[PDB]
Design an enzyme around this catalytic site. Sequence first.
Site, mmCIF file in Angstrom:
data_model
loop_
_atom_site.group_PDB
_atom_site.id
_atom_site.type_symbol
_atom_site.label_atom_id
_atom_site.label_comp_id
_atom_site.label_asym_id
_atom_site.label_seq_id
_atom_site.Cartn_x
_atom_site.Cartn_y
_atom_site.Cartn_z
ATOM 1 N N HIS B 41 0.602 -1.350 0.018
ATOM 2 C CA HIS B 41 0.058 -0.164 -0.112
ATOM 3 C C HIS B 41 0.793 1.241 -0.255
ATOM 4 O O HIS B 41 0.296 2.355 0.089
ATOM 5 C CB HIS B 41 -1.144 -0.039 1.065
ATOM 6 C CG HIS B 41 -0.634 0.035 2.470
ATOM 7 N ND1 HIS B 41 -0.673 -0.745 3.260
ATOM 8 C CD2 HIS B 41 -0.025 1.218 3.056
ATOM 9 C CE1 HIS B 41 -0.098 -0.232 4.618
ATOM 10 N NE2 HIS B 41 0.222 0.862 4.346
ATOM 11 N N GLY B 143 2.347 6.081 9.705
ATOM 12 C CA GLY B 143 3.648 5.914 9.411
ATOM 13 C C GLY B 143 4.433 5.058 9.910
ATOM 14 O O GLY B 143 5.543 4.325 9.366
ATOM 15 N N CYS B 145 3.518 1.755 9.453
ATOM 16 C CA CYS B 145 3.437 0.452 8.374
ATOM 17 C C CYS B 145 4.946 0.096 7.817
ATOM 18 O O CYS B 145 5.653 1.016 7.680
ATOM 19 C CB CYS B 145 2.534 0.929 7.293
ATOM 20 S SG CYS B 145 1.051 1.398 7.696
#
Lengths: 304, 304
Positions: B41, B143, B145
């Site tokens: 993503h 942030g 991830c």
Amino acid sequence: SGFRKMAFPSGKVEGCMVQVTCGTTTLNGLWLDDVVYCPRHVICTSEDMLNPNYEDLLIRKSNHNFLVQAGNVQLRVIGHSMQNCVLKLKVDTANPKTPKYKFVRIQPGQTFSVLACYNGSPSGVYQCAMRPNFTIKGSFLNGSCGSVGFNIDYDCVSFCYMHHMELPTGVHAGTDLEGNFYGPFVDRQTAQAAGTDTTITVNVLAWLYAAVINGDRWFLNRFTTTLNDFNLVAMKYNYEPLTQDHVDILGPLSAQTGIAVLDMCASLKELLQNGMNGRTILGSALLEDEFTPFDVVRQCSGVT
Amino acid sequence: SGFRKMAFPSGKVEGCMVQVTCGTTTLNGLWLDDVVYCPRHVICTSEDMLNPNYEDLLIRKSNHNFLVQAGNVQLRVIGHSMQNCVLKLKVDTANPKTPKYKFVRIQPGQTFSVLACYNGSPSGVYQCAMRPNFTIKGSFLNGSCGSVGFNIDYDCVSFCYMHHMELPTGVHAGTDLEGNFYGPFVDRQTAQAAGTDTTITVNVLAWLYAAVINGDRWFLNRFTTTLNDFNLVAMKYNYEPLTQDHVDILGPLSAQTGIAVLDMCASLKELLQNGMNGRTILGSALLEDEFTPFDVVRQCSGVT
Ligand SMILES: CCc1ccncc1NC(=O)Cc1cccc(C(F)(F)F)n1
Ligand SMILES: CCc1ccncc1NC(=O)Cc1cccc(C(F)(F)F)n1
């Protein structure tokens, strides 16, 4: 979202952990620049620990009697001295992995990460608080002595704790990196009293702000209180008296949530007087006091 | 003595954390050898996340569109591919700090350490459990991830988790290092149901052994039970059914303490039926299920 008892990343500290052997005793040491710091009770034997005369015991020791091992390489010891309850071993090589560091003496109620070690090797990392009575509720076994507690401000590691003893009560006692014990504790295998431990009120409040920030709001109520009224309740439940300094430190959390500090105190007052009623806050069934207001802001804003 | 929610030392993992930017999105990546792994993503924008067509979105991207930064040096990307929900960026340089590592898919109920990161920089480390419903109760912000979960067997890091999403319910979802999500979760900003979460019975029992080992014995009683009788109680309190495998895994703790597994089950049965009565076990007012029997033995024996 979410709130965990988060420790600092331990990498900068792992690179400083060495093994220190002296006679039959093996414990951990902290290698920063050309100096290895470790608890002075490394020079003791099982008989010695009842009432050791450290100046006399250290006189029987020479540089060559202190075996310092970093991973698998041996460090050459060119100097040895006692500073309070720590021995400082001067080695001929500066640690190439020395981070930017300070030696700081923390206050009771402040928090830090511990890197538990055995034979100079790190086993785990956890977040602790220096209790108001100067003990730490750690997780340490025989061989863990010399393991350090620290904080990290971007690239600078502030060493605050060195583990020395487990008190007969199962709680832990240690020193700053100058060898000064926190609390009244001495490095003797004797009866030692840890004072009455209180709950760190400012930390519990900060954790209630963390709860509101993270969705847990049930405990919030229609009441307020005064610093004097709140402190009458804190006295009864062995909580640290809340001061205007504590209120001021909670200011950023109060501003973020829009809940006045004294309103949060009234919520805490009701939680103390009525309990949780079988409910939880941030996955806990008791009032958590090991997160300072700084820890809460850091975790809720992602400070790296 | 003492028992803490201990995480593995994070040093070996900090040395692999990089920052991955793609368009306006910045998240964390895992640099092992000449490959950077990160959530797919990263190629999405705020509009894209409702129902992204990842194959189509990735086609609009070239090696040069993926900005990989390790500390302050830029990595040159010579290849890019999608493996399930992770993107694998081939870089021209092998990470000089790559530890011995495996990619493992953990089971629900197993535990691991998470190194939460922002902009490729580590902020903290905590110990988690993969819930029976395949969610993790982490502490992650926007942030985070790309932050990974791992275990350590002496020098080998087994990567088990990569953080991808926060579910609307505040719980966390992610993948193994092959991009396969744990649970039924998909990387879309949609309504996603985490199943009924149960309590990890074998972990709670292991934690009761840790309590007895560490002085907390009040909950012990004069009763025993059967696997079938215990499981009737576990069913009522949304606990995982206990099997003979679970009993066998608790064998070392049973042998160490001399308390038969079914005797410990009877204690747990009484704690479920009667509650703690305002008492604590290992400093907790609830039944802790995020320590496996392996974690308990490791911590109680000082495995480095
Ligand atoms: C049970 C071992 C253990 C466990 C958890 N932390 C520490 C230890 N080790 C010790 O306390 C060693 C020791 C025994 C007697 C006296 C002294 C003293 F010199 F520091 F005072 N040190
Ligand atoms: C609140 C931000 C945050 C907090 C704690 N962990 C993670 C995040 N970030 C996200 O969840 C980003 C995101 C938003 C929508 C959809 C998706 C998906 F593609 F993975 F499905 N990712």
